[PDB]
Design an enzyme around this catalytic site. Sequence first.
Site, mmCIF file in Angstrom:
data_model
loop_
_atom_site.group_PDB
_atom_site.id
_atom_site.type_symbol
_atom_site.label_atom_id
_atom_site.label_comp_id
_atom_site.label_asym_id
_atom_site.label_seq_id
_atom_site.Cartn_x
_atom_site.Cartn_y
_atom_site.Cartn_z
ATOM 1 N N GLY D 13 -7.110 4.351 2.385
ATOM 2 C CA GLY D 13 -6.149 3.467 3.013
ATOM 3 C C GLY D 13 -5.696 3.791 4.424
ATOM 4 N N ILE D 20 0.705 4.856 6.115
ATOM 5 C CA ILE D 20 1.312 5.707 5.096
ATOM 6 C C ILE D 20 0.297 6.722 4.585
ATOM 7 C CG2 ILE D 20 2.043 5.683 2.686
ATOM 8 C CD1 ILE D 20 3.674 3.112 3.503
ATOM 9 N N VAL D 92 -3.478 0.881 -0.372
ATOM 10 C CA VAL D 92 -4.217 -0.324 -0.017
ATOM 11 C C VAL D 92 -3.468 -1.538 -0.541
ATOM 12 C CG1 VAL D 92 -6.286 -1.677 -0.493
ATOM 13 C CG2 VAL D 92 -6.495 0.761 0.112
ATOM 14 N N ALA D 95 -2.356 -9.447 1.367
ATOM 15 C CA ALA D 95 -2.191 -10.826 0.954
ATOM 16 C C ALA D 95 -2.379 -11.655 2.213
ATOM 17 C CB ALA D 95 -0.816 -11.124 0.339
ATOM 18 N N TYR D 155 8.658 -11.789 0.320
ATOM 19 C CA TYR D 155 7.648 -10.852 -0.165
ATOM 20 C C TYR D 155 6.690 -11.522 -1.151
ATOM 21 C CZ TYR D 155 5.870 -6.144 -0.936
ATOM 22 O OH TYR D 155 5.085 -5.009 -1.009
ATOM 23 N N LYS D 162 2.967 -5.973 -6.679
ATOM 24 C CA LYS D 162 3.550 -4.637 -6.789
ATOM 25 C C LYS D 162 4.190 -4.434 -8.155
ATOM 26 C CE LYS D 162 2.272 -3.127 -2.793
ATOM 27 N NZ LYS D 162 1.377 -1.938 -2.579
ATOM 28 N N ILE D 191 8.642 0.599 6.684
ATOM 29 C CA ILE D 191 8.243 1.465 7.784
ATOM 30 C C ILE D 191 7.177 0.733 8.581
ATOM 31 C CG2 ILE D 191 6.498 2.681 6.392
ATOM 32 C CD1 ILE D 191 7.200 5.190 8.037
ATOM 33 N N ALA D 195 -0.282 -3.099 8.694
ATOM 34 C CA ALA D 195 -0.104 -4.204 7.756
ATOM 35 C C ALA D 195 1.308 -4.780 7.827
ATOM 36 C CB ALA D 195 -0.427 -3.739 6.338
#
Lengths: 267, 267, 272, 268
Positions: D13, D20, D92, D95, D155, D162, D191, D195
């Site tokens: 990722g 991250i 990873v 959308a 979201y 998630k 953060i 993405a």
Amino acid sequence: MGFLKGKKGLIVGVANNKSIAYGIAQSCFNQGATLAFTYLNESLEKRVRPIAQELNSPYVYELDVSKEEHFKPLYDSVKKDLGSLDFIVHSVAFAPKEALEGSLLETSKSAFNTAMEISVYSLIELTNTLKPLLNNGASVLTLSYLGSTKYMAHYNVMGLAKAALESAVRYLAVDLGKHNIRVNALSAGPIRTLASSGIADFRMILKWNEINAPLRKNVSLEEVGNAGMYLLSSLSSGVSGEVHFVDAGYHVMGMGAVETLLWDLHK
Amino acid sequence: MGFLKGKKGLIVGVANNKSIAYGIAQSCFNQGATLAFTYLNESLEKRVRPIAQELNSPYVYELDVSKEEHFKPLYDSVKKDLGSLDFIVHSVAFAPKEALEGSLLETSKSAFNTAMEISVYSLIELTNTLKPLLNNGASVLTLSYLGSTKYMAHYNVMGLAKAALESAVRYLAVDLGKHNIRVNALSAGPIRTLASSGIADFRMILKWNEINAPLRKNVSLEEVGNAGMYLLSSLSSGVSGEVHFVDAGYHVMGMGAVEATLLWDLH
Amino acid sequence: MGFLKGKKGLIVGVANNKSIAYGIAQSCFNQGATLAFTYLNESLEKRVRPIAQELNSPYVYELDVSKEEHFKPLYDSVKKDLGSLDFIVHSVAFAPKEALEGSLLETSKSAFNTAMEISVYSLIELTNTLKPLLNNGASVLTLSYLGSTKYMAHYNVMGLAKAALESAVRYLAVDLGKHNIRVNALSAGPIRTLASSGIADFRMILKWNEINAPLRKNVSLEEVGNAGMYLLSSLSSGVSGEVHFVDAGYHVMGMGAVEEKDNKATLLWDLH
Amino acid sequence: MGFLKGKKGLIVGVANNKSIAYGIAQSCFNQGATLAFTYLNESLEKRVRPIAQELNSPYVYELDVSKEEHFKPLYDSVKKDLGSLDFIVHSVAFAPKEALEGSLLETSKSAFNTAMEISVYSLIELTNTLKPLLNNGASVLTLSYLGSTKYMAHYNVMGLAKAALESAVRYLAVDLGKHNIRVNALSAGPIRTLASSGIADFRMILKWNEINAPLRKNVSLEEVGNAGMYLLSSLSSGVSGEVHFVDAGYHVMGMGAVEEATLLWDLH
Ligand SMILES: NC(=O)c1ccc[n+]([C@@H]2O[C@H](COP(=O)([O-])OP(=O)(O)OC[C@H]3O[C@@H](n4cnc5c(N)ncnc54)[C@H](O)[C@@H]3O)[C@@H](O)[C@H]2O)c1
Ligand SMILES: NC(=O)c1ccc[n+]([C@@H]2O[C@H](COP(=O)([O-])OP(=O)(O)OC[C@H]3O[C@@H](n4cnc5c(N)ncnc54)[C@H](O)[C@@H]3O)[C@@H](O)[C@H]2O)c1
Ligand SMILES: NC(=O)c1ccc[n+]([C@@H]2O[C@H](COP(=O)([O-])OP(=O)(O)OC[C@H]3O[C@@H](n4cnc5c(N)ncnc54)[C@H](O)[C@@H]3O)[C@@H](O)[C@H]2O)c1
Ligand SMILES: NC(=O)c1ccc[n+]([C@@H]2O[C@H](COP(=O)([O-])OP(=O)(O)OC[C@H]3O[C@@H](n4cnc5c(N)ncnc54)[C@H](O)[C@@H]3O)[C@@H](O)[C@H]2O)c1
């Protein structure tokens, strides 16, 4: 006095007289509701029609949530026969049987997609299709299970589906909440249904729930139905985005019940 | 038709016709319930008695939950007047005014013990006292608030009490499930009551909930009352150990609502 | 490189070398912390002192959290010895044995108050006392158990206490976060401690955890200790208000674990 | 050396030095780990290769999680170059940008399937492929966000994914715990990453997190990396199936933060 008198609802998910969707529809009808029903196919249609008839409804429509072309005719049928909707029951799920046996690591991609599409995306597509028909104060209900947020024996990919479904309920509660429309999930304990019998060794889950639930019983169809009706009716107009357990209290258990484990007394 | 016809219930916590316990009692009365009421002291008796008469009840008993001397006479009164109970509403909390200001770090031991004894232990003592009078299928309901599990502005010790209260609901659900007795909590959104108006932060919390709830409204007393009636009635006989949110959906928000601009900023 | 090098911490709740407070203290010591310890009474001092010495600490003070008069001298001792504090470990609880048997229904009012005062309010009073000594960045850790948020056999009033304790963690994290001070709870699986031993219901809860946990083992004192040191060190400086499970994964389980064979399930308990 | 010395880990990722996955990799490297990295395509390889090299890794493999033909090659590459694995980082998600606009109700079926496949099923396929290489005590970590269990603005399907991802963490923890293998999610506060920057809503979510979090700050890359490193190391060998919040405490807030009866955001 009926708490759904003059109210109009669509019931998606009756398969026979054991279906959770049927228990909910029966409680709604007993509260005065005017109902419509979908069936997945022609073999189920011959079960759904006499059921709809016992609840005073000729409004029976075909809906395979996997077929996008079924949704616009559904919208046309409901609009012509009912005019508008005070509630929708979304009581449908499916994952292939081989994904529920074995392990999650072992899930194929197509089993994953099918479970998500049929159990989760179908709520998005059903509600979006019917949204223009929804009255002020309307209520959308779907069905879920504790396997979403805790491990339950080889619910596997459906646990992932029901976790996404409960999240959908929260986002849809916000999307539709500005239109004074509520969205909720009823999280039922295990119960014998057509879909239940398709899970190998489901009687072990039902027996573990029965012995370890606070109320030391499995939930009845009418208990699930009455809780659904409450959430669909104006009694619950202060309730939205909620996951409501109707499971004889089983969700509070952090371990097996004792007296010695009740399970070991059951031997 | 009435879902509490012939059912006998004790209502602990009416202070006036704005009390949550009054909203619940009113809904229970409209469902055919035979009601009894307690009063904190003789000053509050002047408002409880007219409310009880309005709801067709001559059964008005003294209960200051901090006074052990009241519990056995309450038992005597209920057994002599009603014989048995089908449900108990526990709608009682207290913390010193200064404790709900400022910070939790400043809480005195005595204020901490008072909040815990009045708001939490009282449910244990009330239920244990009246347990020999509880019929099969009886329902015990207490009242909680989101500050138990999330931080809410200066809720402080009362968030500790409410967290303990919801845990008591779970253990009591197990304790009484043996006897097909249910224990639940209704977690209401903010609503103007005598006790709530005694907080400085209340207007702003009430306004924060109104703007940011999915349904963009504060909950009504009748909405809280009806959800309580549901949890007290056989309609929810499959439901126990539940924390039931009647808060216009507010519990699902993880941040302020938006429109990107905060809805709060538009108002 | 020691994640607590030069950091000063107070350990409240060591009773012997099986204490969770000792496992945490040991991992903190191994990460370079300077430690002080408290003891309940002179009987427990006889065990706390050799442990303190073992972990390079000559700072050992009396603290019975039920006696208000102990808290200012505690503040004065710490101030005089260490100057300031970079972390606190609050590893203390008590309920009369009566209360952890039978039902919650039959809990006495005195047992309830005792449980709440020792297990919950002690954290408020301890933190409020030491609060003027806490440095920017300091970390306060308490210990909890899954019986807070789920039914666990006969945990009873202590489940209520732990629920309120986890709620206190959230409120204190807000109160203290203004000063860049963190507050967390470590929720451990069952482990035999002196306080574990008092419960007659305990060997079974331990064995049930061991059989049914994802990792099919009870947690070790070292695993509890290392998780605590993490939460107390700056490695976790983005973490506050957290209830952190160190329990071999047990918290995820909705029912007993099974063995799968020929599409048929057998509970691991039944093979046991 | 540190708590990962001699330990072999795969990092899936990394997009650049703000990822991250990069911050977690960096922390793992400082604890003595032997690292290997995957990249999506040649464009992304252009930044993953230098990053792997500043972390002393010659092992750089292609992995588009939507192409299952990549997965046994990855297995072969790892088995040859490292022999086994002590931990995996699954960092990873994706959308369609349109799907994080507006409402969940307008999500298209293809958008939903892409989000679910990239963000959720990829953890299943990656872990199943690499399972024979996982040693005793291995640790598998993925990344989640509070939008799984709470509403977060716009979201939408990423919240659904998630939520499914955290459920998968629980089932995989049961499946793999038989072999003393741990599976966890790190739930990071917002953060700024590649993405995340491509969302209209993000700047405001950052600022809302910063004002209202108990620590009154956003989390740093190193805070997320260090928490990831902890979950991947023997320090957390008693922790599995956990959703671990690294968000400056934001997850505890039931409403906006206030001050003597005024919202901190209004002072802002
Ligand atoms: N123990 C339980 O049975 C239980 C407990 C928890 C939740 N639930 C949930 O209850 C709901 C209803 O299931 P049930 O238990 O009543 O069983 P059921 O078999 O009676 O109902 C399932 C329904 O889903 C329908 N369906 C499947 N695929 C479809 C498709 N492509 N298009 C349209 N309809 C389709 C079936 O035709 C059937 O009408 C599901 O969401 C299920 O997960 C079940
Ligand atoms: N916004 C809200 O008002 C709100 C929201 C969530 C939950 N709650 C909960 O609802 C319950 C009822 O409160 P309310 O808002 O209706 O306020 P209220 O003032 O109408 O009722 C509270 C009752 O508690 C009684 N009481 C206080 N100390 C007592 C004692 N020692 N013995 C007996 N009775 C005692 C008061 O006399 C009063 O009748 C409480 O548990 C409260 O925490 C309130
Ligand atoms: N052992 C477990 O299974 C378990 C699991 C989860 C969490 N916990 C929590 O861990 C913490 C520590 O318990 P433990 O298991 O290490 O047992 P322990 O006996 O080793 O530690 C408990 C400590 O509390 C101290 N204490 C009791 N009353 C006190 C008082 N009035 N003043 C000062 N100190 C007092 C005791 O003296 C002892 O040092 C407790 O909060 C406990 O609830 C324990
Ligand atoms: N940034 C945040 O605020 C935040 C918050 C919480 C969690 N998360 C999660 O953290 C993880 C990493 O994201 P990030 O913020 O570091 O951003 P990033 O853009 O640096 O990383 C996303 C990575 O996913 C990869 N990816 C996308 N589609 C792929 C595919 N088909 N095959 C292979 N790789 C693919 C990208 O190439 C990139 O390397 C994600 O799971 C994300 O949801 C991010």
